[PDB]
Amino acid sequence: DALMSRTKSSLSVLESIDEFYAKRASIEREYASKLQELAASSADIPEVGSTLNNILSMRTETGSMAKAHEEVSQQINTELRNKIREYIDQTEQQKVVAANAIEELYQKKTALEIDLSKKKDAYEYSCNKLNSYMRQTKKMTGRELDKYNLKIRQAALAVKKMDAEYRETNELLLTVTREWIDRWTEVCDAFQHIEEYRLEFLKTNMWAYANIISTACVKDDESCEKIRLTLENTNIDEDITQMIQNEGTGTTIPPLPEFNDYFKEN
């Protein structure tokens, strides 16, 4: 009944899925965030002049350009902060090994001492093989072939010695397993501890996953509220006024043609 394969297969499924979570986090920033982090800030932030002479209707354009960039400073944070959490999968994907390679090899050694001792017991099933040949002497003595009784002594002394083996191998193999019913309950209990705390790790480390992106959502949303604030301070009648002084060409009327006379210099 080598059913340690079932509790040892539970360990094959604790790291083949932890790999997926760490693969997902490792992928949800290079296949998701290496785009906005890069494309938003990098491809943007030029010195292309807004060329709006309006000191105010220009505050809102750069405000839209700035908050495009103060939106990307927040997807970079997730790219950083969430690849500084996948590094907590390895403090479980390899810390669990500290909790499952210590009381596993220490339990393997005893688990095979049983295996050959029982094989030594089934090998010492000769108490039966000489009992079979003992009875067949007694069976054939009903015919009385006159000194089979000497043979019967032999198998009688033989049976005595060879069950003294069987009783010896049986009491030993008894406590070898009686001390394995005990110690196997300790791996049953220990595995149910760190296969129950792995779930608290999974749940608590995934609850801190959305709280890592919910920050990102509230960041750029709060930054979008800043594009509407910069967009409310605009007062237009003062704006063209400020813009006229720049592009102003002339304020006095083009004086009219007057008829120049003859006595100008007479």
Added chain:
Amino acid sequence: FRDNFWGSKDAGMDALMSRTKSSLSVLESIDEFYAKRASIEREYASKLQELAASSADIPEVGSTLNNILSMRTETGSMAKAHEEVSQQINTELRNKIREYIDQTEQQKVVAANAIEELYQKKTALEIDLSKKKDAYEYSCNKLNSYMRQTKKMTGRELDKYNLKIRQAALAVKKMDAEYRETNELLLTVTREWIDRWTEVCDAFQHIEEYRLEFLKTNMWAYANIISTACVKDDESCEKIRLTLENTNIDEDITQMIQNEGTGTTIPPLPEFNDYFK
């Protein structure tokens, strides 16, 4: 208020002809800015609904299967959220910029229609009035040269003076008909030129007080097209955390180990008194 755009002759028109070409260069720079932001977000949703829908079969199952899958099914919510963003940018935002681009160029013709008619009519007279003042002040040099030579060479002789009255009629001729008249055709044109030009400055001022309000109301749409995604993403975050509060530790009740009735006493007892006794 925009009366103060007169200047010398053509500075005003060219100062106002550069403002429209610069104003148009503001909106097209704003238009393209959406196009660049558009495909950026469009690439964001491509990868996400790729990443979300690229599901695979792994030994996970049970009440913890919800949370892991909750994470996969909310990366497709982001894609849907940010595809709408880019969608709302090229369909609504960019296209409505192309609206005011064309509406205004068609309105920038109606405003100043006959400006070059009067500007060139005013120039024709300006130079032609200068052609006439040119002759008038050459016509008076000769007269002075005939009334100043007679000044030093006084009337001490007997020569017919008809040189003066012959050319005095010229001075009146060239002056009156050709200067006091084209200086009055220029006046009536000028007084209308000031009128029409004053109404063209007023007409673009009104246009400029729209472009500023339009840009504000357009970028306000831009801000709220993004806030659409932000609350969508934020709401789908509690959906992750709603499915994490649903997780109790009973998934280890999903047991596969074959036990509970095994591990017997095992003191093998073949005494071989089964029959033999």
